[PDB]
Amino acid sequence: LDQLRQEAEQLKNQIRDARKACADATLSQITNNIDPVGRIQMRTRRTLRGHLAKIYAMHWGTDSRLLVSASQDGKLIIWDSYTTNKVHAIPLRSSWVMTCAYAPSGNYVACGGLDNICSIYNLKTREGNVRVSRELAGHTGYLSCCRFLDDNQIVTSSGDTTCALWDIETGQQTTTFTGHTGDVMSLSLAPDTRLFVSGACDASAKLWDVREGMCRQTFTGHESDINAICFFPNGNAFATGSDDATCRLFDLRADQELMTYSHDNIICGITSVSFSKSGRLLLAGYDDFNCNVWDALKADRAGVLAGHDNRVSCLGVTDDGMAVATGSWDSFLKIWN
Amino acid sequence: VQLVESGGGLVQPGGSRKLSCSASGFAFSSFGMHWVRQAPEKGLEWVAYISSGSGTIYYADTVKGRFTISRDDPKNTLFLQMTSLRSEDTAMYYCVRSIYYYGSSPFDFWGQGTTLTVSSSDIVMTQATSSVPVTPGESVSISCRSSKSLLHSNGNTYLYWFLQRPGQSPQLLIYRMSNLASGVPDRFSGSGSGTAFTLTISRLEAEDVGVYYCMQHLEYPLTFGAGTKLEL
């Protein structure tokens, strides 16, 4: 038994040596030449009010106009962000929703939480009302995140330390991803949707192959719980947000940390992260009630989206990069531009 | 989804009659309801509208004051009290559901219609071609035109296309001049420039023959075209 353990230690040492060999340069040095982004000024274009409790998740539709927000008052609300009109108000079977998703086709929304179930809702019914299409049971812990691949495939992360890929038609988990030793808190599909990455409470992020069903890479830079994870638009990198108050940019090909975004007087955790369309801005939500905008290539804050009276729990950028939505525990979403 | 109307039959001029439609198979409470009538030898004509929750009601000037539209959401029934009936009111009355939200399809489902017999600034929509000879397998196009431009500042061209086959209620083909309705074959296609619009059918089947009605939803007096007929 101990021979396996020492072989594992040797493999970790070899991996570290290879990563160090590939660390000849630092992203900061290479980016020192380019001009920094100015003071990124954004103001609340819209304030989406109507939730009567903490908002825990929000997601944009691929049309960049409709968004769904989940709150623990037991409601999913589909908003028309241009007009602030409530397109739908879906009453949930369990009010402890901690995640929500919008199908890329716009036909379905998903949500889950402490019920350990991911419920898919059919928006495009002929009866004119939204009804639950499928209930995805099989996780033993709370549902932390869920993201559609197609109208029929959804991958979910759970607090039981496993991620699962589901066939919505049958309701069975086609694949189960294991290897995290802590609760999986976030999840992010690659732009091609052939790979996805997940952050866990073990302070490590793991890259998975959707079709092969096994972990390709593991990243362990963070010093604490990872609360959020987002894929860089190119699909060759991803950023993580942790309770240790720092973001960290990892690159799949270089297989190691590239940059860490932190400041001395910001000490709270990070509830969500996201990128702008180019990838120059890395917008992160914090428990100190405001979101910070980071110059992804230069590590320095470019702005602050203050204006929430409580923790900024969720954060998203439209597919066309035209706006940013930030939900909060004060029960208001705000569109910033 | 079924809308079944009743209350037709002979009525002496100046009398009163109540039309009712029974709604089943859909959330009647969340749909706006329209009444549309069709004279035995004329095209469609909007009558009245009642919004979801009965918060808004509209009538055509020809029936305003005389008629009144009401709905019973718990009983999923829609009513139309018609008083002081006149010979001009002889027509088959349809009940049409419509739900209004971003991306919805108003006028998606029509009822089977009830026949009423009376004993003996509006936008104008023009369908110049009354009839067209057509055979199956070919390509056909139907033109349309309006007095006002139907393109709104928000980017929506509020034009609707309906097909009424012999002995059948109108079926929504296109809503807002480009969006194909659910269940319609892809061979149908709509387009327009804001004031002139066209509907095209490719490799049309033998079941595609009928009268094609154009409708505008930009303003309250909703108005239909004369209708273009396709005959085998």
Next chain:
Amino acid sequence: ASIAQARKLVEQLKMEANIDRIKVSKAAADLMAYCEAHAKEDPLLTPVPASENPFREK
């Protein structure tokens, strides 16, 4: 027992160590190239005219 767990863990590290990872300098260059190639298309990085902004106030 833990023998299976240890074996699958060591096999997982063996897979992770066999990837063809590239130099960090090239990765940074790729990220810079992507950011610059799409900088002009990002409204948040380069604000657009109010006439184009779908979220105009009043």
Next chain:
Amino acid sequence: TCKNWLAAEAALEKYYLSIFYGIEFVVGVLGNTIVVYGYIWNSSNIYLFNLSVSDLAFLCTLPMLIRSYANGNWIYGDVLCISNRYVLHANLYTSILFLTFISIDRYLIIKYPFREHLLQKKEFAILISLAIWVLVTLELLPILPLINPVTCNDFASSGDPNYNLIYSMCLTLLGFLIPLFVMCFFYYKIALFLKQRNRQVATALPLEKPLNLVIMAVVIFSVLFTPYHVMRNVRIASRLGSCTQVVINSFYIVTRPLAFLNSVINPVFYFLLGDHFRDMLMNQ
């Protein structure tokens, strides 16, 4: 003892009034300002906020009043005389009516703990708040004929005693007595509730403090206002009919600051003695 009593009332109106009104202004406006900052919701906060605003507006009418008593002459003009004495009395009876609705509000919250009742909504709270301002303004309007100058003249001494007597009696009954009975009745119901539900579980902290404040609220209100209303009516009746007006008067002046002291201690009693409010005020 004509001479003594006379010089006495002159001394009272000259120095005592200026000194008392001066201190009431210093602490009262200071107190009413910090709480006004403290407040800035629910029906309870609306009534409490309006009470503070009404109290502050009442206190804003004292400064030129103090100077005139210090000078002994009205140098500010007739128009200011009417406005101040009207605004002074308008806010005095507006505060009394807001204290009544605070007691009603506090009674509702123990009867409908989740704010189910109609009166507990912010909208109906604001509607009642405006109605209180309007009604007090309307029912105090008949004061205008009396406060016509001639020179400065206090509300009781001004105008025709015959018409003033009945109006003062009516304003007392509508403005003071009826609100007093309503306030006492509802704070009595709050008392009974607090004493019956003091300790349903023997180990819980008792409700002694809330009961003390509820009792103190009625005691503070009744003690400060009743002497003033009694003296105003008797003084006015003194001018009616046939050196005895001197002593009836001299009594009237001494109780006037007492009634006006409520606007001084209201923010302390209703916002500082409340530990939750005081804790919020420090944190703010």
Next chain:
Amino acid sequence: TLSAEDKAAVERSKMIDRNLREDGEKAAREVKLLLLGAGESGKNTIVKQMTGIVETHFTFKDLHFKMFDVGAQRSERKKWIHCFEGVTAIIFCVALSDYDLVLNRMHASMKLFDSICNNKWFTDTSIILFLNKKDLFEEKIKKSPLTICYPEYAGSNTYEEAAAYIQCQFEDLNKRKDTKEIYTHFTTKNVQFVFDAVTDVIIKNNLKDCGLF
């Protein structure tokens, strides 16, 4: 300036707002209780008296209670405990027969109670503490002493003194005596006690709001 269909959409949005407000008003009247405790503390019997979270809905003397049994969540409690910030009170269950049981087992119960009571999300949330299995405690204490779990204990072995000692040993874990109250109870009497404690909490919160507390 809106088109007909835009006006209809706005009407739909207003109807949705009205329904949301009605739902929120209805929800406000609900008392939300978080049920916690050790695995074998007797939470099941307490629930009876009234794969993830389990919500129990009961009505007692015009108060509708929602009790959420989250014991089935084996995941990390630190990541979702904030979801229950705002519950009226926490019901904590411990078994008085866990001195010599091991998992020590009462020491685990005290550890969990210390974590829950001094959590930053429950600084002002009142706690209703149920001490279960008092009969089994009465039987067991006659044979095994309380010294096994509390070596510093110096009182008699009688049921009353030992029960009081355990109660105060649990209540002294409260580091914020001023802002939070613990309603200890030895387990219809249970439902009546829950109702009384909840009513006291609600009244004290209302008095805090009105400035009377």
